[PDB]
Design a protein around this ligand. Sequence first.
Ligand code: NAG
Ligand code: NAG
Ligand code: NAG
Ligand code: NAG
Lengths: 532, 532
Amino acid sequence: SELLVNTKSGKVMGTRVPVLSSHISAFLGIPFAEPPVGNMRFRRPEPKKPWSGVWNASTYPNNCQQYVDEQFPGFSGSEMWNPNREMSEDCLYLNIWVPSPRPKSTTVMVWIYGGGFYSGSSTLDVYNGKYLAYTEEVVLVSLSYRVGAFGFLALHGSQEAPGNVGLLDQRMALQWVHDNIQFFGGDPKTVTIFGESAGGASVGMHILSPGSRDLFRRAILQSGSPNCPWASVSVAEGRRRAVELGRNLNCNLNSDEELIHCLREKKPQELIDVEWNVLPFDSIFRFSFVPVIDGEFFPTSLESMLNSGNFKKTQILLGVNKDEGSFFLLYGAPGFSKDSESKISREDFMSGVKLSVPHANDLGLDAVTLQYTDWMDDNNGIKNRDGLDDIVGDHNVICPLMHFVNKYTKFGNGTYLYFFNHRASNLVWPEWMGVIHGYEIEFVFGLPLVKELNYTAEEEALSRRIMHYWATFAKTGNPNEPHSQESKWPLFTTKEQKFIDLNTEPMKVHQRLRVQMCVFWNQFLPKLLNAT
Amino acid sequence: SELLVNTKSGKVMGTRVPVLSSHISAFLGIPFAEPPVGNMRFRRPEPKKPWSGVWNASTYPNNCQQYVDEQFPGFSGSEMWNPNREMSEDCLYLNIWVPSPRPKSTTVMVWIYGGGFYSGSSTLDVYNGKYLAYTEEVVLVSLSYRVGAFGFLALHGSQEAPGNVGLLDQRMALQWVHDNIQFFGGDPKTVTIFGESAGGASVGMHILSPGSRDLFRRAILQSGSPNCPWASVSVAEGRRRAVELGRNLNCNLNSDEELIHCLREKKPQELIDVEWNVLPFDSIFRFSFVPVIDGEFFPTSLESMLNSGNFKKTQILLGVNKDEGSFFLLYGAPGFSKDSESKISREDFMSGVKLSVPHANDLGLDAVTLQYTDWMDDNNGIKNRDGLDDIVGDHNVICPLMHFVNKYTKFGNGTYLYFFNHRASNLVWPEWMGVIHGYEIEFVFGLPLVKELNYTAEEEALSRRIMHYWATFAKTGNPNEPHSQESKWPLFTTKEQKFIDLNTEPMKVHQRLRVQMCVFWNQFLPKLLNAT
Ligand SMILES: *[C@@H]1O[C@H](CO)[C@@H](O)[C@H](O)[C@H]1NC(C)=O
Ligand SMILES: *[C@@H]1O[C@H](CO)[C@@H](O)[C@H](O)[C@H]1NC(C)=O
Ligand SMILES: *[C@@H]1O[C@H](CO)[C@@H](O)[C@H](O)[C@H]1NC(C)=O
Ligand SMILES: *[C@@H]1O[C@H](CO)[C@@H](O)[C@H](O)[C@H]1NC(C)=O
């Protein structure tokens, strides 16, 4: 039967799912690791023991334990990102969408969800891989990984809570795909990993980590890069936060053994309730438990690895959205509200700047303020609001990604860069937020092709174009159709640094994406902070 | 006789001079101090002893000893600024242009020439006061003062070479005008002092110095302010330079007495030949002997005086030219030439930046470079050239003046600000230099009214308009004609910060002159240099 597949770990039975007046096969909730529960909490993952009989892969699995956003109860704009299945530490499963009839050896794409390393689910409606798998005829896989303390609590030196286990969860899933996707009709030698935000940073981390490089062919990074300021911490800071978490739960702190034992006896929600109390600074776009530069998963500092070319050399396709920072300002900066235009006063602008660059001294804060202030009209509420939006997006997403693309392109085999700037016609978030962090995902997954979702005809066309770019890149290492008559997405080169916009208007090629601001964030500010 | 005037110092006989098909009286070369020669070199000036008989004031006096520019021999653009009379240490004289018939008690304007405190003459063709005196019916006076080491060598603590004597020369001339102008038909209670560059800085210094305030009514500052970075030095730096001058002339340096005695035995040209060897840094727009913050002429630091309102409160009219920095880049920055378009390479841009801000550390240099570089087109020769031009003009003239105007306006009785941006149709300097430092002077003195000079009809109109603004301001404290139908020059206020452009086009009012760059130069950079 087309729904029965025998893998190296055992047999699995999928389910036939409808999609755009047709059907395809789906294998949901396939286990790739042993449940990281009890004594296994915080530990590196262990491969799933093979099973006898048939694994029922007809329904989505549980989501990993995580902080749940209740800032806007009932609001679809925020709830669409929350777990839609019951949460459990028993959450290491993957999902596969297979074209029908089953292919023999076709292109494989593996999705890695984002969520700042503190949240995320492979089961969100927005991550339904049936549209992409059906439309582009690729085998689509979505994996899962532990987030928050469960996946990133780090007490370097200890083997019980070494840190980065969430990244190892991802690697184990990639290993499973490498070893078994052939039975689902996928080509293990043509696997593209792609992800957004923390998922994009994760993709870059697998490009960097020697232990992950051999498991995939190409990569796509959406609004995220491994060198982002929020994406990793030092071993010392990771330890400090782990200890502070224990301090928040009245744990014995005399030794790592004592601390970990205490943390392992706590219910999942107990850790989550105090998770945010361990941050250094009053800040936005900063998360408690993230990857740690350990000298193992990451041999040396990310910068030294990027500079020496110590990473997988292949083709990459990546990009950012126009207003990456709006989400974070709305949730934590004074003056911003969901139901108002959020015009910002000069004073709230100052407060926002300090929250946005928590590690900077006063001189550093002055430099940022000067760089983003129009002194001919400094009390303009719209300008201050948009200025802060740019500060957050440039510092946390765009400039780190531009630093990554330029360093990578020197050693890589082909780079394609995009700037997504289309605001969906059916967005429920206010207009001031613009082209929001994460809202290009629905286009990548083809939701606009579903009539009931209320997208325009132009948006369906944009989605089809984007899905074809992504899948063609996954298949050939080039988003462009060999010998087509459509406008070509030029290769990003060290010299020309070209990129294209992604919207419903005719393709336009540009150069040096936000170069002025990124020279500030990537070269000047770091120098200022290190000298003063 | 109309040409004979009896002053408190003795009788003087002037000469009738033709002017625009008419005539007026001129009294040239009137002594206001005893020749500062021999034992008097470097000493404060002494009032001229009254004389018997009639002083022959029919010809221009000698010019003070100074460095003479020979960079472009025979070239009118540069030679028009050089001394046009024989040089001598016996140079403290003033010139007066009086309307005919002699007025009874009319508005008086006293011109103070510029020249970076190292040069200047009251006798330049461009400073001929007959046009202004005749056209606006004012008594026009031009004074002189010692420049270079002769007027500013400073060995604080010593009464033989205390420093600032050139400024005291200016004060003595103002005192003479206060005491005697009434005999020439001028009103000593309605005297306006005006000057350009070092002369403008000098005007601001008299506004600040308690000992000079009572000698004039209003002031006009053209392309210069007392707080300019090149306009003064500390007592320590002044001493260091005085000692280095002695070291350059093989002087005994065991004591001030030894040093001064040695310097007094040297011929004037001997001092001038080594004058430029005492600067701290490799730099442009920096001069060796300038005013010193002594605690006498200047009670405290200029900044503390400006902040506390420790200065004469009256009305002021001031402004700058569009391209103040071009002259200095042409003479000392690599890549600039008089006969080429001077497109600057990225490398020469860097060299230029270091020469322009000699006191800045590397981080400071990086900040300037970032602020003036278009990173989307960094190798554009025109942009690099114009960027450097702006750096020099903003740092040395515009921003210091804007800091002055804003601090002054808080306590003053009326401020009028202008931005001169008309390039003369008959300029002999290359086009890349734009609206050059000092080229608004010919309009203020009415040269465009002289047909033989080859100016256009529009330029004659601009000159007449400017002369009337200046003279009306001198007479009433307001450049505008009471109840006229012409466009009004608005008052510059702390809140609106309005100013007008001065060109042949219809008047346009603007606000916050180069505010973006001046926040950088006046607030950010100083903070960066002091913290790092
Ligand atoms: C497990 O598979 C069976 C079919 O064998 C079916 O009941 C369903 O798809 C799964 N069970 C649940 C939880 O509904
Ligand atoms: C990628 O690598 C292949 C084989 O080494 C080479 O022929 C090709 O030019 C490379 N492409 C780029 C854009 O570097
Ligand atoms: C001095 O005045 C006399 C007239 O009394 C006349 O010769 C001339 O104006 C002056 N002398 C010189 C130096 O020409
Ligand atoms: C100048 O001073 C006079 C008298 O003190 C005052 O009436 C006038 O308002 C002042 N003007 C300005 C612009 O400050």
